[PDB]
Write a protein that binds this ligand. Structure first.
Ligand code: FAD
Ligand code: FAD
Ligand code: NH4
Ligand code: NH4
Ligand code: NA
Lengths: 536, 534
């Protein structure tokens, strides 16, 4: 009877939330005619970033599915559930269509080109089966196609060009209303069909996908809880923080040092899985201040609002570029003659065995927890590339894409290229941006951060903790820390590396004479904010 | 002959643009009511009581500007009439010659102008003259702001913003005045003589003001008047545009430039050569159509600067004692040292032996304008950060030699800077150190060698701390301390200890801080002083 009436699918990939979910609303729009809802997620070997993934992000993802499932049950008195499958989407959806007739398959759009093949196969399937393929934009602030269209059919390569494009377009859509689940119908599937199509009964663990709690030697430290429920708690906290900050005259972040000793309050992973709607984030910041805004005069939330648009910028840049995550064949990235892969240096970098305390601390925190402050992401990225080992950013990106809790394909690639390959931004070759030691004394004066993530430095006194090599032979003995034994010797000479790298970047500028269009800082001031530079 | 005429009486508001009083005066043109443009040197109007050569010249420049514009727009028919004498007496005598239907003025909100204005109000009642007053010297009607804040002025800049956020945007500038078809009066030549109507604009010397500023030849770098004001606004708008395009918003991003071109409109704003509403709205309209929600846009800081001016003007409105410590409820009573006339005079003359202080005080005498950071420096040095003398001596000297010198803005800043005992950041010799400050503000001593000529030959390594030259170096560079350049008049190290202690005692004797004019928070201090995040 109900199986004859039919159903709509809301297919989660990203967009892992019930709030501001226009695809979900569309799936629910046929309630009146008794048409059921089938909420589903499919472990694909790909979807939601599961191809190149580590334990920390796997756990975060599983947390977010568990959250959706929980909310589903709670609001339907147990009738509704998240159906989690493992297998190929086209195969799964064709079989499900047989069991109960699918009126619509509804998705939140995934604008990155690495999702095009997956989605075309479902679009193609929907044609053959006469299913309505409903695709709604809500992972990004605006319809990236609209932005690209308004910018002459190509993507803005510069943050400021990006703002100039959306200023023409106007404010982004507000979040949609909440979904009404109380009166939804859900399907009972045949238990033998469920066995056959690999419908999980309990949500799988990371180990089931052959992903274990060991990140290159480090015991995974789980400081975040994935999911829409947490995402909304974190939003509240951040809105309060913004309010206090404004009240106390703090506008731009340059008015306070980056704080790397901070609690795990970041919503970056939540934004990447859509546990938090970026439109809800944008608009609740806007509504919090706009009332108290007086003309063109500074109001609250200005910077945080711009942060969201940085996300928008990189996502949008990627849309029509399958080569976004590499240098060769990528026409928005400069061709820079990086050194040949040196696996020894690459592993040392990956492991936090470089011999520069701050780099090592950042990399080890990365492996353990899967999240770094923007400023530490700059520092290890700069060190790996232009300001250091002169290794291609592509090695850095593949490492980040695995061990970060966020690791948005487009955003991670974008920041990597922006930082490493903007040859014509000469500030970026300066040592105030390069020097990991001076930056350590600024970010971590007392060695608190360094001693935490580089525990062999624990007894080295504050005087030497940033520069353990300056200890004498005797001192290294006294503090149980021998350079080349207990803690690695610096794997490269930074001063000569910087001299060599500048020359090479200047030589590259000379051969182009004129800068081709590439992903780059809008201007020098933008670089200064972006690296949180100390006036100087 | 009972035709009638309206007076537009300039005191401040020295401009034809955005002049609702002028517009009101012109509004009867169709009934053939003439216009009589009037300025009166009455001993005090437009800050002419305690005035030096430089500002008198700026003022005369602005009067000349109005007169030239009046002539150019009427083929010589319209003239600015400038009298010397007492306003009530002058308007009474004028009214006998030609019936006055209205006397129109831009409001002067400072209490120091209440006696003058009430005397004309009273005269208008008696003579059946309509006394018309318009708000256009300030952004909002200061009375409204005060009513909105519980009947008392906001003592804090943030409290002030909070108060105007409730009221909404300030009025836009008015349309331009249409003078071409206007009528003017020809008075009786004898009446003109007996009433001391000038034929040519007076010079400062007519008022016993001479081009010598405490031994300093007056250097006129500024041109008074609306015409010049409108040009400077255009230049400034282009600056804001380029500043926004290159990413600069808060300007903790750029060092203060103390040796910049004479581009400030501070004096023009004080005299009303430039409408503050035109400034506000020109900035706003430049960026609002490219602002997206709550995101940063252009002109944020400059707009705020206009608000600081509003903040201080408003605060003074109902406080005749704004310019002094005793009897002044919004100023903490601080036990300043009794006057030391030698030290005060050394401060005025730039004979303190600290190059930056001396440089700034001499620039002040010669040119009558200083960068905000230099005003801060010489102000904390006189009081609190140095000599421990009352800000009152600082104010009276500023009110004389500055090109701007708004009674309320000047007093308000002097108090904010000198007497905010509870902002401990202001205690730190690190924001009171003129040597460290000079090395940051003027690394090559370019500014110092200009206004302190005797240091001209001192190498860069020594120009900020000349006393560090050996006997031989002092001789070689023609700068003997105590001889060519005075010895430091005070030991700052010991002074800072002494001063911090006194301020601490003050804070400790008041268990709870009374309401007083003060910074809103530490971050505000940081921007106000242009501090290096250190
Ligand atoms: C080498 C490198 C790789 C990076 N990879 C990622 C990534 O995979 N995913 C990711 O979200 N960010 C990435 N970033 C940018 C940035 O460091 C993180 O977004 C930031 O650290 C998140 O912390 P937060 O939530 O407290 O940021 P906030 O300053 O509080 O900003 C809030 C949100 O705005 C967005 N945002 C902030 N900065 C950027 C930025 N530079 N580019 C794009 N969006 C931004 C993020 O969604 C962030 O969560 C990378 C930066 C570098 C240098
Ligand atoms: C002891 C002391 C006395 C002062 N006396 C005066 C004075 O008599 N008249 C005066 O206009 N300013 C005064 N100021 C404030 C300030 O230094 C000047 O307004 C500024 O130097 C003018 O330069 P600018 O036009 O380039 O400023 P901008 O930064 O370009 O600001 C533009 C306008 O905003 C207003 N503004 C800026 N800062 C302030 C401020 N702190 N308080 C009130 N308004 C401000 C002024 O009208 C100024 O012209 C004083 C400051 C101190 C510390
Ligand atoms: N969204
Ligand atoms: N003169
Ligand atoms: Na993110």
């Amino acid at each position: 009877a109900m199986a004859t009436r039919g159903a709509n699918v809301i297919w989660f990939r990203h967009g892992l939330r019930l709030h501001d979910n226009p695809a979900l609303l569309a799936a629910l729009a046929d309630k009146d005619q008794g048409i059921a809802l089938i909420p589903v997620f499919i472990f694909d070997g790909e979807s939601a970033g599961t191809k190149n993934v580590g334990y920390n992000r796997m756990r975060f993802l599983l947390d977010s599915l568990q959250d959706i499932d929980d909310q589903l049950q709670a609001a339907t008195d147990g009738r509704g559930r998240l159906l989690v499958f493992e297998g190929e989407p086209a195969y799964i959806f064709r079989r499900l269509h047989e069991q109960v007739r699918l009126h619509r398959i509804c998705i939140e759009q995934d604008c990155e080109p690495i999702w095009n093949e997956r989605d075309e196969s479902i679009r193609s399937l929907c044609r053959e089966l006469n299913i309505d393929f409903v695709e709604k934009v809500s992972h990004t602030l605006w319809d990236p196609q609209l932005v690209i269209e308004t910018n002459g059919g190509i993507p803005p390569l510069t943050y400021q060009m990006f703002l100039h494009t959306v200023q023409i377009i106007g404010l982004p859509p507000r979040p949609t209303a909440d979904a009404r689940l109380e009166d939804a119908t859900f399907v009972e599937l045949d238990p033998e069909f469920c066995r056959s199509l690999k419908l999980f009964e309990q949500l799988p663990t990371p180990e089931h996908f052959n992903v274990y709690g060991d990140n290159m030697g480090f015991l995974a430290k789980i400081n975040w809880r994935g999911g829409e429920t947490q995402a909304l708690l974190l939003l509240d906290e951040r809105l309060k923080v913004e309010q206090h900050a404004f009240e106390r005259g703090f506008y731009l972040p340059n008015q306070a040092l980056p704080n790397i000793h901070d609690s795990p309050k970041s919503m970056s992973a939540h934004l990447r899985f859509g546990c938090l709607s970026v439109r809800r984030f944008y608009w609740s910041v806007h509504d919090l201040f706009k009332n108290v805004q007086l003309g063109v005069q500074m109001t609250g939330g200005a910077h945080i609002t711009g942060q969201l648009i940085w996300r928008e910028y990189f996502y949008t840049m990627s849309v029509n570029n399958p080569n976004y995550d590499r240098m060769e064949g990528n026409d928005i990235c400069l061709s820079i003659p990086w050194a040949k892969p040196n696996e020894n240096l690459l592993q040392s970098w990956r492991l936090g065995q470089t011999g520069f305390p701050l780099i090592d601390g950042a990399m080890r925190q990365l492996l353990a927890e899967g999240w770094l402050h923007h400023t530490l992401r700059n520092t290890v990225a700069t060190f790996l590339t232009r300001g250091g080992l002169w290794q291609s950013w592509e090695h850095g990106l593949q490492h980040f894409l695995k061990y970060l809790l966020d690791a948005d394909w487009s955003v991670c690639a974008g920041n990597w290229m922006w930082v490493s390959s903007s040859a014509f931004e000469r500030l970026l070759d300066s040592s105030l941006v390069t020097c990991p030691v001076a930056l350590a004394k600024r970010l971590d004066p007392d060695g608190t951060y360094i001693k935490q993530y580089v525990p062999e430095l624990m007894n080295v006194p504050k005087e030497f903790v940033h520069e353990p090599w300056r200890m004498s032979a005797e001192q290294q003995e006294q503090y149980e820390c021998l350079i080349g034994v207990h803690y690695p010797e610096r794997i490269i000479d930074l001063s000569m590396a910087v001299k060599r790298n500048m020359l090479a970047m200047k030589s590259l500028r000379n051969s182009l004479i004129t800068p081709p269009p590439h992903c780059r800082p809008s201007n020098e001031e933008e670089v200064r904010q972006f690296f949180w530079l100390a006036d100087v």
